[PDB]
Amino acid sequence: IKEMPQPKTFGELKNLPLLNTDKPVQALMKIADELGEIFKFEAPGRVTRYLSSQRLIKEACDESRFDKNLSQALKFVRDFAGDGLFTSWTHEKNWKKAHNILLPSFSQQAMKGYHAMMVDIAVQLVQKWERLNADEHIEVPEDMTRLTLDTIGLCGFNYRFNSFYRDQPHPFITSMVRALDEAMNKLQRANPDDPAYDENKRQFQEDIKVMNDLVDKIIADRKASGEQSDDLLTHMLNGKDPETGEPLDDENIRYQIITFLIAGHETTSGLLSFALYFLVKNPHVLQKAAEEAARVLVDPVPSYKQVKQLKYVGMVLNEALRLWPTAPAFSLYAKEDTVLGGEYPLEKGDELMVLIPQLHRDKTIWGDDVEEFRPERFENPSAIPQHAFKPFGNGQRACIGQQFALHEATLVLGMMLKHFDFEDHTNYELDIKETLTLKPEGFVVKAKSKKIPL
Numbered sequence: 001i002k003e004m005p006q007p008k009t010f011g012e013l014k015n016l017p018l019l020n021t022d023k024p025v026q027a028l029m030k031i032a033d034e035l036g037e038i039f040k041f042e043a044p045g046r047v048t049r050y051l052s053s054q055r056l057i058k059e060a061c062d063e064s065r066f067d068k069n070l071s072q073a074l075k076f077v078r079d080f081a082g083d084g085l086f087t088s089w090t091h092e093k094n095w096k097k098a099h100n101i102l103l104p105s106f107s108q109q110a111m112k113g114y115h116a117m118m119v120d121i122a123v124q125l126v127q128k129w130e131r132l133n134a135d136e137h138i139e140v141p142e143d144m145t146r147l148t149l150d151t152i153g154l155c156g157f158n159y160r161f162n163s164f165y166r167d168q169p170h171p172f173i174t175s176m177v178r179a180l181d182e183a184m185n186k187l188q189r190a191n192p193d194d195p196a197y198d199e200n201k202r203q204f205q206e207d208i209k210v211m212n213d214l215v216d217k218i219i220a221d222r223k224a225s226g227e228q229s230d231d232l233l234t235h236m237l238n239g240k241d242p243e244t245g246e247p248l249d250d251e252n253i254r255y256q257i258i259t260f261l262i263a264g265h266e267t268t269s270g271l272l273s274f275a276l277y278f279l280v281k282n283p284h285v286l287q288k289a290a291e292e293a294a295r296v297l298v299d300p301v302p303s304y305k306q307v308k309q310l311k312y313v314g315m316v317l318n319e320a321l322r323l324w325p326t327a328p329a330f331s332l333y334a335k336e337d338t339v340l341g342g343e344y345p346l347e348k349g350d351e352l353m354v355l356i357p358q359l360h361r362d363k364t365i366w367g368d369d370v371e372e373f374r375p376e377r378f379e380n381p382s383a384i385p386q387h388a389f390k391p392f393g394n395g396q397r398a399c400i401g402q403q404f405a406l407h408e409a410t411l412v413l414g415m416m417l418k419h420f421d422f423e424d425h426t427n428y429e430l431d432i433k434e435t436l437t438l439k440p441e442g443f444v445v446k447a448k449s450k451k452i453p454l
């Protein structure tokens with residue numbers, strides 16, 4: 001049995017001031033580089049252990065030994081995402097019920113149904129870029145977030161956010177972004193009761209009311225009309241859990257909708273942003289990806305079958321998820337006393353944090369070149385060890401949106417590479433903003449149209 005290292009302390013605040021930074025995940029990554037595969041992290045009233053090696057993470061991913069934990073980030077997001085799938089405990093009735101009802105909505109087979117809606121928004125992105133003047137550039141995370149919010153609005157509840165028509169966000173989205181900001185800033189506060197945060201707390205309750213009022217009105221307007229659009233909302237109003245035989249109640253459906261809107265706004269847009277970043281920084285890779293896009297997407301409207309043929313585009317997306325998994329951590333608790341790694345005794349209830357960006361840099365798995373962007377690592381899916389690559393979390397609590405996200409990202413990146421050449425005209429220095437997720441702030445490019453009709 002071994003004693004684990006611990007980063008520098010601040011007296012009675014223990015390690016908590018290490019999170020007083022706009023880039024706490026990047027700070028924890030640097031601490032893992034200094035300390036190794038495991039370190040203890042303490043705050044007043046709390047202890048966790050940060051894991052970075054595939055050796056320890058493969059054990060943490062054993063569902064017989066560990067279940068999903070709500071990290072302080074997720075407990076704070078739970079104040080507006082409720083017992084939706086992302087912020088429920090595995091043992092809460094609504095977790096398994098919603099999981100069983102929603103799984104078929106999110107299958108690879110269901111993607112054939114969403115494809116046409118995804119294409120609608122992707123074509124809006126391509127037309128936006130085709131219509132820029134010579135002197136203009138693209139704001140990449142801004143445009144990718146317009147796309148992914150619109151896609152989940154249309155697939156989620158047949159609602160057009162029309163993000164490509166506006167500068168200012170939808171009222172729901174201003175409240176959702178401000179609530180995500182509160183939840184993520186609050187876990188850093190050395191003195192959460194400071195009157196300096198009274199206004200933040202007032203605003204947070206206001207933002208919860210806005211999200212609830214607006215989503216509850218979407219649900220009630222849909223129940224009033226009777227309309228049967230092929231969207232997640234229809235599936236949730238109609239679907240029955242085989243186990244309980246019950247449908248979701250209207251409060252839980254509201255939490256699921258809020259949850260899908262957080263996911264679409266925060267995650268897939270980060271992935272696309274990082275992927276285009278690595279492509280403009282790696283022109284050999286961009287050429288191989290653009291060759292596949294040109295050869296496969298032979299029609300002005302991509303088909304479902306064509307998007308499945310974009311093998312290398314998919315490899316690019318996986319390599320971007322390796323280096324910068326946009327949802328960069330997940331948390332576990334020990335179901336019972338257990339020894340991790342033959343070395344670290346844990347008691348029932350003990351928490352672990354999985355630092356996904358560090359897992360994905362384990363040289364014992366990936367080799368010495370871990371910082372290089374090389375989609376060829378993913379040529380042969382067989383060759384990636386179990387629990388080596390975990391950008392969608394683990395087991396029954398893995399991302400239900402994984403197929404949706406990869407379908408949208410493969411479609412959109414393929415269309416981008418078909419329709420334009422890209423220039424890193426500013427020699428962009430990567431600057432990773434942390435919200436719920438990671439995104440490359442201030443990333444801009446110029447696109448030169450290949451002048452291929454839609």
Ligand code: HEM
Nearest residue numbers: 085086260263267268327330391392393397399400401405
């Ligand atoms: C590249 C895009 C995305 C990434 C990287 C991502 C990542 C993740 C990860 C890491 C988790 C596990 C969290 C944990 O263990 O605490 C998760 C859970 C989840 N994700 Fe995603 N996600 C993505 C896109 C989406 C989309 C598009 C949806 C839905 C519209 C979605 C819905 C969910 C839900 C509902 C859960 C909770 C599942 C459950 O516990 O039953 N995600 N995601």
Ligand SMILES: O=C(COc1ccc(OC(F)(F)F)cc1)N[C@@H](Cc1ccccc1)C(=O)O
Nearest residue numbers: 043046071072073187327328329330353436437
């Ligand atoms: O380590 C992290 C990283 O933050 C994120 C956790 C989840 C997360 O959600 C997602 F990965 F899904 F995006 C995003 C960021 N969070 C920890 C930070 C912490 C706070 C107080 C005491 C000890 C540790 C946590 O939220 O518990």
